[model samples]
Every structure is written in structure tokens, then in C-alpha cells.
Target: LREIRNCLLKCISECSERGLVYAVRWAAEMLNGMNPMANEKLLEVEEKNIYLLAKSYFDCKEFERAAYTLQNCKSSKSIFLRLYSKYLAGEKKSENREFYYISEVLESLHYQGNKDPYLLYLSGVVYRKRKQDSKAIDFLKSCVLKAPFFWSAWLELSLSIDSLETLTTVVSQLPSTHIMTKIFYVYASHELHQVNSSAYEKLAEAEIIFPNSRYLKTQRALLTYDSRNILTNDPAENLYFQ
Candidate 1:
């Protein structure tokens, strides 16, 4: 069962990377179908709907409502959502004063052996807010290392970086040959405005793999825009030059 779970997860990840949403969903369903624990159960469909409902509440900033809706679920993602929603709800009210305890809660959970990357990310965000950058970077680095596909983790990690030299070091520590690493190097360097030439060059390389990617095209255009030169031509023409 453990091996099967890993197989399904890899299938989900690959399908997700290829932009096959339906296949990813099917793979996830196959995973849930084999869940051995059935006590206090919401059927998988019910659980998914509940998650989606809470997700809408989350999107609407009804954080407490989202937390409440997610309270009963046993899924890892659902648990993370509840914790994050509670944190956000606490953050929204300045006097609520108690919201910061989410960090302690996350810490205890981590010490208890729940090192899920989502939890790591939440901890990193909390630490960053408290201006404890090194701690935040540590957790964020681990989160990205464990889950390179979580682009939000990579974004948070990038913000922790302040220079091209720092980014180079961090990039070297990542899954160096993975496409996510290539994207992160370009994205972080572009954000820092410290490696303009290499950002474009690496972005061009990434485009070879994702030729139709609007995101890469936009990044290329942004690189051009940052050079203080207007791109009057259509995006496809002379992308490498002015």
C-alpha cells in the first residue's frame, strides 16, 4: 500500500506537470479509494466537496468559516487548510492577539513528527512575519527541497534572498536539473533584478521545453521591459533581442 501510494502520487505529480487536470484528479481519487482508515468518515466525494466549499470561504476571506469547515477532515491538505485558515483569521484581527500561536502549534506538530511541507511553509511565513529571516529561510529551504513543485514555497524562498550570489548558492542546493530549478533561478534572479542577462538566457533555455508557455513569454517580455526599451513588435518576433 505504501508503494502504491507513492506510485499514485508520482502519477499525480507528472499529470499535474503536463497540465492534465482530469488525470491528476483521477489519480488522486484512486489514492483516496484505498484509504484504510474509515472511522468518522466523510466519503471521498463529500470530503472533496467540503474542501472545495472551505476553499471558497478561504478565497472570500471568511477564514474562520473555512477553518470550521475543514475541522473534521483527516486529509493532509484539509488539515493544512484548517490550520492556515485559523492563522489567517487570527491575523485579520489585530487585537485577536492569539493568532500568532499558530507558529507554536505548528512547531509542536513538527516536533511530534509532522514535517509536511505545507506545515513547513506556514512556519516559514510566520517566522518571516516576525522578521526572523534565518529561521524562515531554513524552513522555506526545507519545504522547497521536499516539494519542488510547490511554486509558492519557491516564491517565499526567493523573497528571502537579497542578491544574485545568494540565489546562485540556493539554486545550486536545489534539484539542479529539474525544470522547477530552472524556473526558480530565472524567477528569483528576475525578481532581484541582479542577473538580467542570465535571467534571459536561462528563460530562453526553459522556453525550449515549454515552447508554448505564456508564462515564459511574459517573463521574456518583462525582461525586455526592465531594460528600459519598449517592445513594439508582437511577442513572438525577435524575443531574444529588442
Candidate 2:
């Protein structure tokens, strides 16, 4: 224990602006070697190391340990750790909780900190899961606007626009050959046909975008079958046969 404390102190003493991040990161790693919950002393030690240690544990997939460390810390770091732990656990409710807490943190973060596109993209995902389509769209739009080449953010934004018309508009703003634009065009066209005949225009556009997409072919086949069924069952046309 004396040896470990000496090493930690040495690292802390040597820490500079650039080195502090790494020092904290390594100290957290050292704490992981000890049984953190065995006694008050260890817990106290952990309070000093919690955020960095929990971050390391989270990176290593030591979710339960990360959660415990965060609980001891009881700060913003704890909030993120708990959210990440629940996410890793695959808890369904965690999705909503993560969304709420992440949003809270982002709101609280300074304007300069909030400029991160990654945070915006993550918030967009949470909003999508929470069924807040408009908010999801707004966040995802910000993500893509801040980082146009971020394919994941673009795809998520495409999904947040639920209706075919809105999806069509969203797709147009993204780059061509983007996989998300293709997916949106196909899905939106199929949904559009359910409510309007102008969906054919969108379907044709999708074919132009992805000439060989199975989705387009399948949608075309289904629409054809539905049209045939409607024509065959028309009372005016079938009266003579009946």
C-alpha cells in the first residue's frame, strides 16, 4: 500500500497540463487493482480517483465496478458512468434515462463544451428512442451540420424524420451515395404510397439512386399487387362478370 501511494504521488507530482490527463487516467488504473468496497479507507481512496477510475473501468467494460466507483464519487462523472453502465447492461429503460441525463449534462455544459458533434449525435439517438421526433431531428441536424461527413449522424437524422415528405427533404440535404439517403428514399417512398399517389415520383427517384436495391423492387411488387387487387375488385368493372 505504501509503495502504491508513493507511485501515485510521484505521478501526481510530475503531472503537467498535458500529463495530468494521463496521470489521472493511470491512477484510476492502479486503484482498480485494489478491492475498492472492502472498507471505508478504500472507499475514501476511490472518492479521489472516482471519475478517472470509472472512466477507465467503463473503457474496459468493467461496468459494475465503474458504476460503484461513480456512486462513490456522486458527481457529473457519476451521472455519465451510471448511464453508460445501464446502457452496457442492455436495460431497456436505461435508454430513456441516458437520454434524460445526457441532455441535462449537455444543457449544463458551457457553450464551448456543447459544441461537440458527438454529443449532439448521441442526444439525437436518445430523442429518437424517446419518440421525440422533432427534437431528434433538431439534434441530428446539428450533428450533421457540424460534421457533414459523420455518416452515423446523417443516418440517424434520416430516421428521425418519420413522414415520407419530411424524409425526402432531409435526404436531399445529405450527400449522394450516402447509405442513409438510399435507406430513407426507399422507406419513405413505401410509406408515402400508403397515403398519396405522388409516392410514385419518390419511388422512381429511389430507383435512380439505387437501381438494384431489393427494397425498391419489393415495394414496387407490393404496390403492383395492391393495384391489381383494387382493379379486379372494382364494382363497376366486375358487375358484368358477377
Candidate 3:
């Protein structure tokens, strides 16, 4: 433990600068995950907490703030997160061609070597926005398998697959700890004509918690009317179509 603290102390001197961002991230993750009280030893000369600061911004979906937190660093996670946050934001306006820049980053990572699951997942997300469904699937699948709790990756994989058989195959492999897994399970069962009252119960539960949720509310609101020339009070059937 002394050895690690020594290393962390050294990195703290130049953390957040390019080539040192990884050390900052490592130390920050260790501090945040293992010992929050170790904050005193880490000094910030530039007022940039780097990993911890950017991480909070990233969690809040404020990528610009994250990028600015650790300036002049080309670390994979920083660049990848910034690029993806921009990518998702620009998806509609850019005519789906904003993939080249993000690809360049991955290319650099490839030669330099990066096995980070979120980086892999970011690659998939970039591909998905570019309409490269197959490539996206490969990345997303690998990402989820490597990190099963990456719910965003799993959700992306599920949404990308338009085929019932493929979606069912993917859904069955997912753990049911997340609400999204349950949602897909409910919807997939309806699509497969295997839906039961239990599916309806889950949907109802989701609606109560997520009253303003469009997907859940839209789903529930369609229970009795055939929006597509279909009608059934039973949410167990048509409500699951989407």
C-alpha cells in the first residue's frame, strides 16, 4: 500500500497533463473507490481534478465540462467520452457522417493498445450512429460480455436488432437486474406471442415509477386502441408490439 501511495503521490504532481491522465485516473478511481479520505495527499496545481471532476461531469451528461476539466490530455477515456457525448448530440444534424474522427481515436488506441470495455462500447455506439449495425453489434456484444453490467451497451444491442429471433436470443442472455432487461423481456415476449399477465404487471409498475416516461407511458396508453388498426384492452398483447 505504501508503494502505491508513493506512485500516486508522484503522479499527482503532473496528473491531468497529457501522458499523465492515466495516472490521474488510476489514482482518482482508487481514491474514490477504496479510500475517499486519501483526498488530502492529491494536490491540484491547475484546479483540475481531472478524473474525478470529469467523471462527475460525464455522469451528469455534461461532456464539455469534462473535456475542459482535464485540458490538453488525449487519454482514450477522455477523448472517447468527449467524442461520444458530441457524437450522440450531433447525430441528427450531422447527416450520420461524424464517425471518422471517433474512428481515428480508436485507430490510435488500437496501435497504442487499449482493452477498456467502455472504449469498446464507445466504438459500438459510434458505429451504431453511423448505421453500421453489424459492426456495432460485434463491439456491443463483446463489450457486454466483458462487462455485463454495461447496461447501455446491452440496450444499444437490443435496440439495434430489429429481428425478433435475434433480439430474443440476445435478451435471453442478459441478466435481469436492470429495468431495461425487464422492459425488453416484456416487449420481446409480446412480439413472440408468448406474453402473459406478468408482462402487463411489469409495464404497470414501470408506468407508476416513470409516469412522464414517453416509452412506458406511450406503451401503456395504447392498451385498448389499435393505433395501427388494432384494438385490444389487453396490454398483454398489442401494447407489447413496439
lDDT by residue (tens digit), candidate 2, 1-242: 66786677566445533456556556757755576322534544446555656665666566767776676353433554565575565454445365566567556652544445666776687778788888888778777766765666755765576676677566567665554455445444444444245445556766786799654576565556545333345432321212
Candidate 3: which stretches are off by over 4 Å? 1-48, 52-65, 68-76, 92-95, 168-242
lDDT of 1 by residue, 1-242 (tens): 68997887688667767766666655665666675544323544557656655665666667888888777876667878998998778777765344467777787778886777888998888787777777887899899888988877877787787777777777777787778888888777767776566667778789999999866877777677677633565544323222
Sequence-dependent TM-score of model 1: 0.67
Expressed as tens digits, the lDDT of each residue in 115-195 for candidate 3 is 567888888877887788878877777787677756567667765676666665776666654566666666555444455
**lDDT of predicted model 1:** 0.74
**Best candidate (score: TM-score):** 1
Rank order (by lDDT, best first): 1, 3, 2
Specify the highest-lDDT model's number.
Answer: 1
- The per-candidate count of clashes, in order, stands at 0, 0, 1
Task: Report the candidate with higher lDDT, 2 versus 3.
Answer: 3
TM-score order, best first, reads 1, 3, 2
